[PDB]
Scaffold this active site. Structure first.
Site, short mmCIF file in Angstrom:
data_model
loop_
_atom_site.label_atom_id
_atom_site.label_comp_id
_atom_site.label_asym_id
_atom_site.label_seq_id
_atom_site.Cartn_x
_atom_site.Cartn_y
_atom_site.Cartn_z
N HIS A 191 21.37 -15.15 -2.73
CA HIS A 191 20.05 -15.66 -2.35
C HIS A 191 19.53 -16.65 -3.39
O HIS A 191 19.64 -16.41 -4.60
CB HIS A 191 19.05 -14.52 -2.16
CG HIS A 191 19.29 -13.72 -0.91
ND1 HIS A 191 18.27 -13.10 -0.22
CD2 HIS A 191 20.42 -13.44 -0.23
CE1 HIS A 191 18.77 -12.48 0.84
NE2 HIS A 191 20.07 -12.67 0.85
N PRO A 209 10.28 -0.03 -8.23
CA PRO A 209 11.22 -0.94 -7.57
C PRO A 209 10.76 -2.36 -7.21
O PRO A 209 11.60 -3.18 -6.84
CB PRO A 209 11.64 -0.16 -6.32
CG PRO A 209 10.45 0.71 -6.05
CD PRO A 209 10.03 1.17 -7.40
N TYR A 222 8.14 -10.31 0.32
CA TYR A 222 7.28 -9.31 -0.31
C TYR A 222 5.91 -9.64 0.28
O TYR A 222 5.50 -10.79 0.25
CB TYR A 222 7.22 -9.50 -1.83
CG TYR A 222 8.47 -9.08 -2.57
CD1 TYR A 222 9.59 -9.91 -2.64
CD2 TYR A 222 8.53 -7.84 -3.21
CE1 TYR A 222 10.74 -9.52 -3.32
CE2 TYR A 222 9.68 -7.44 -3.90
CZ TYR A 222 10.78 -8.29 -3.95
OH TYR A 222 11.90 -7.90 -4.62
C1 FAS Z 1 15.01 8.15 -5.12
C2 FAS Z 1 15.25 6.75 -5.67
C3 FAS Z 1 15.08 5.66 -4.88
C4 FAS Z 1 15.31 4.37 -5.40
N1 FAS Z 1 15.14 3.29 -4.64
C5 FAS Z 1 15.17 2.08 -5.19
C6 FAS Z 1 14.86 0.90 -4.37
O1 FAS Z 1 14.51 1.03 -3.22
N2 FAS Z 1 14.97 -0.31 -4.97
C7 FAS Z 1 15.30 -0.49 -6.28
O2 FAS Z 1 15.34 -1.61 -6.81
N3 FAS Z 1 15.60 0.66 -7.02
C8 FAS Z 1 15.57 1.90 -6.52
N4 FAS Z 1 15.90 3.00 -7.27
C9 FAS Z 1 16.43 2.91 -8.68
C10 FAS Z 1 17.92 3.15 -8.69
O3 FAS Z 1 18.55 1.92 -8.36
C11 FAS Z 1 18.29 3.60 -10.06
O4 FAS Z 1 17.75 2.70 -11.03
C12 FAS Z 1 19.80 3.78 -10.22
O5 FAS Z 1 20.21 4.73 -9.22
C13 FAS Z 1 20.09 4.31 -11.57
O6 FAS Z 1 21.47 4.52 -11.77
P1 FAS Z 1 21.92 5.59 -12.84
O7 FAS Z 1 21.28 5.38 -14.16
O8 FAS Z 1 23.38 5.63 -12.75
O9 FAS Z 1 21.36 6.95 -12.26
P2 FAS Z 1 21.47 7.76 -10.89
O10 FAS Z 1 20.29 8.66 -10.77
O11 FAS Z 1 21.82 6.86 -9.76
O12 FAS Z 1 22.77 8.62 -11.16
C14 FAS Z 1 22.76 9.65 -12.13
C15 FAS Z 1 23.84 10.64 -11.74
O13 FAS Z 1 23.81 11.72 -12.66
C16 FAS Z 1 24.01 12.95 -11.99
N5 FAS Z 1 23.50 14.10 -12.74
C17 FAS Z 1 22.20 14.50 -12.84
N6 FAS Z 1 22.02 15.49 -13.69
C18 FAS Z 1 23.29 15.86 -14.06
C19 FAS Z 1 23.73 16.89 -14.86
N7 FAS Z 1 22.88 17.74 -15.45
N8 FAS Z 1 25.07 17.01 -15.00
C20 FAS Z 1 25.86 16.20 -14.34
N9 FAS Z 1 25.55 15.21 -13.50
C21 FAS Z 1 24.22 15.05 -13.46
C22 FAS Z 1 23.26 12.75 -10.72
O14 FAS Z 1 23.71 13.70 -9.75
C23 FAS Z 1 23.60 11.30 -10.37
O15 FAS Z 1 24.87 11.23 -9.70
C24 FAS Z 1 15.71 4.24 -6.76
C25 FAS Z 1 15.89 5.39 -7.54
C26 FAS Z 1 15.69 6.62 -7.05
C27 FAS Z 1 15.91 7.83 -8.00
#
Ligand code: FAS
Ligand code: FAS
EC number: 1.14.13.2
Lengths: 391, 391
Positions: free
Chosen positions: A72, A293, A201
């Site tokens: 984009h 977000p 937006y």
């Molecule tokens: C509900 C939600 C909705 C979102 N929607 C948007 C959106 O619409 N637009 C946008 O720009 N961003 C959004 N985000 C932000 C999203 O993009 C995050 O920034 C991104 O998933 C982060 O990636 P990680 O840091 O890898 O963490 P993640 O949370 O993706 O991954 C962390 C991993 O660690 C694992 N874990 C947790 N505790 C553990 C433990 N004790 N032992 C072992 N494993 C464990 C979890 O199961 C998960 O697999 C959203 C985030 C969330 C939480």
């Protein structure tokens, strides 16, 4: 068992870090609480900065992205009966962003990891970290009911906001900065063509609305809703009607609607912890910070933390320069704070806040008018949106 | 008595409007509640935008300004142990600002008016406005104890924040937007050389500080203080010590101090009323809006309102285009809101607010770092500071 780098969490942060390290010859084990299926069920983000795109190419996981990702060059902001397009490419000096779903990125990484044979333990229960300030830290967890011990040199906490890693640092060593917003976003994924080729937006009196996409036949929409709402109160029919009410008529009339593939409410929050490390433990991604977000920075900040941690670990292992690891937090925090400032600004100008006096509403409208009407103003939005350069 | 345009108030707004109209052959009478001496006792503003400078030249009152005014090409912002200079000329596309005191501007105008013989009635008590929506409005006032009536075509309310003109519009016709800040500015005028050749705005943990000037041997300094303070609590000695504590050491050590010529506390506020007219009455300057002094826009907005009113009255009298006067508020409000937004931004990033949580303090610091470190960011400050172009 033993490894060099133990990675807690198999979301994009841990998987990306694990692939880069693997390719560089640094052994790593990933421990994930959930199953592969559960991880792949998360929809989340859809906008990637060039830095992350390049990092994916570097990890050797960019074929499908290069094929299916949508590049984009602009984005629109609709407010007070008008649509303003920000020419990101022109205003940022030729930079753009790529639309490619986080679910897709995660799937690509999981495949690459599976294929290379690197160690990944799903359903690793009750993960605990030990001897963080020692020469030899270790992780314990339960698999099947058996408690295993994993010895390592360093631990990367890539377990998100509710992970065990941030909880493992003595509270008195961390300084938390947090802001909770009085609203959440109700998102809906549909197998329909996007209403626009670029994101829209929208600041509307009824509240914020966002028109996004995943592909040419897959759309992703969001509407601001009070924290008291529950998704079961929102039928697809109710969502569409509300979305349309918040969009410019010409846009609302082009909208192709359909049944939701996914629908959920995610609350908004800003969160930063300082420092982002403790001994042999380094936090990355959502484990260390959260951004609303609005500016699409969450996944993108995870990428820059991982890029920084990977390069510092390379110096440590390849060149024996372990001391450089002490600079991890300082480097990341500089980028994090600037992205937090932008996401906060984005959020404050596009959302309707409860209990806003007349002066503030007028200032919010004037912010939009000024920034979207000035070359210098547009430039501040564009350079921040494409993403500031990695350090 | 009768005149064409009745002007309430003899501060810079009314005097400037009266001189321009006089020179264009449109008769005007100025009514002022105070004496000439009282008006000249006010210190106030010291920074003029080019638009105002040109307007003064047009009113034919620019000799002393051209001689004594100081043209500034930059301004500095000190925060978190650093001084950042904004090159206004480079960043705004060659525009600059002129430092020439409001007291001086007022004195120049008063002289010009006295010399041309235009009517000015000082000590005009209990001014009242009548038949505002008629074909022939009029003003009544008391001189010596006698109540006189002044018939006119139009009335310009240039009587400041507490003037009678804004009070004369049916409250239900006005929409007010207001914000009061939890602090004031303690200003001190001294017959000493300025500590810098350009202004230094300083954000310090102890609060805001500003180093300004009037000439090569006259300085003007300000420090943020709580609204509970009283000037008698601040000896010159106390002021200097506090000022120094809020400035970068290298600046604080170059500071030449001395006895105050003037010292007072002025509280901060934002205020806008819509519309800015009613029938044959047009509000201008402080009578219609207030901005915190952080962005130096008060006197400058009075100038643009006057420029707009003067040009519309010229069309009405010279070309018989009276209808254009209906557009006065719309034209002025567009500029006013943008200047209010900038003054508000300036104020929020430079002052220390009571009850600020950790997140907000960090965001305030990051705002400074971002804006002062980005070319696009610096440009937004510069273009707003030199002043957006008149419409
Ligand atoms: C509900 C939600 C909705 C979102 N929607 C948007 C959106 O619409 N637009 C946008 O720009 N961003 C959004 N985000 C932000 C999203 O993009 C995050 O920034 C991104 O998933 C982060 O990636 P990680 O840091 O890898 O963490 P993640 O949370 O993706 O991954 C962390 C991993 O660690 C694992 N874990 C947790 N505790 C553990 C433990 N004790 N032992 C072992 N494993 C464990 C979890 O199961 C998960 O697999 C959203 C985030 C969330 C939480
Ligand atoms: C106390 C104070 C301190 C300030 N300091 C700064 C500063 O440090 N930096 C900065 O950038 N800006 C400052 N300003 C803003 C200042 O520059 C104003 O914007 C500017 O004086 C406005 O000019 P006028 O609109 O002409 O109003 P003014 O208030 O200057 O003049 C209005 C005139 O109307 C007269 N009047 C009032 N009621 C009347 C009535 N009923 N009948 C007849 N006459 C009547 C008044 O006596 C006065 O002479 C300050 C303002 C104030 C009020």
């Amino acid at each position: 068992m033993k490894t060099q780098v133990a990675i807690i969490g198999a979301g994009p942060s841990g998987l990306l870090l694990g692939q880069l390290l693997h390719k560089a010859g640094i052994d790593n084990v990933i421990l994930e609480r959930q199953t592969p299926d559960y991880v792949l069920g998360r929809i989340r983000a859809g906008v990637l900065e060039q830095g992350m795109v390049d990092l994916l190419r570097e990890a050797g996981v960019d074929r499908r992205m290069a094929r299916d990702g949508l590049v984009h060059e602009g984005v629109e902001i609709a407010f007070a009966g008008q649509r303003r397009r920000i020419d990101l490419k022109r205003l940022s000096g030729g930079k753009t962003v790529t639309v490619y779903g986080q679910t897709e990125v995660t799937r690509d990484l999981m495949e690459a990891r599976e294929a290379c044979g690197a160690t990944t333990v799903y359903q690793a229960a009750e993960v605990r970290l030990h001897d963080l300030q020692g020469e030899r830290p270790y992780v314990t967890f339960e698999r099947d009911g058996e408690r295993l011990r994993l010895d390592c040199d360093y631990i990367a906490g890539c377990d998100g906001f509710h992970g065990i890693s941030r909880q493992s640092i003595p509270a008195e060593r961390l300084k938390v900065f947090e802001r909770v917003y009085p609203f959440g976003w109700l998102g809906l994924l549909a197998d329909t063509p996007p209403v626009s080729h670029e994101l829209i937006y929208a600041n509307h009196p009824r509240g914020f609305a966002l028109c996004s996409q995943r592909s040419a036949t897959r759309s992703r929409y969001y509407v601001q809703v009070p924290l008291t709402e529950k998704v079961e109160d929102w039928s697809d029919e109710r969502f569409w009607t509300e979305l349309k009410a918040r969009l410019p008529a010409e846009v609302a009339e082009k909208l192709v609607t359909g049944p939701s593939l996914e629908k959920s409410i995610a609350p908004l929050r800003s969160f930063v912890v300082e420092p982002m490390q403790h001994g042999r433990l380094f936090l990355a991604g959502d484990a260390a910070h959260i951004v609303p977000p609005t500016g699409a920075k969450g996944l993108n900040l995870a990428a820059s933390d991982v890029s920084t941690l990977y390069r510092l670990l390379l110096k440590a292992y390849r060149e024996g320069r372990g001391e450089l690891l002490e600079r991890y937090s300082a480097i990341c925090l500089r980028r994090i704070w600037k992205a937090e400032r932008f996401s906060w600004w984005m959020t404050s100008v596009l959302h309707r806040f409860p209990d806003t006096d007349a002066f503030s509403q007028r200032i919010q409208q004037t912010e939009l008018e000024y920034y979207l009407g000035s070359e210098a103003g547009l430039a501040t939005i564009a350079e921040n949106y494409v993403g500031l350069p990695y350090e």
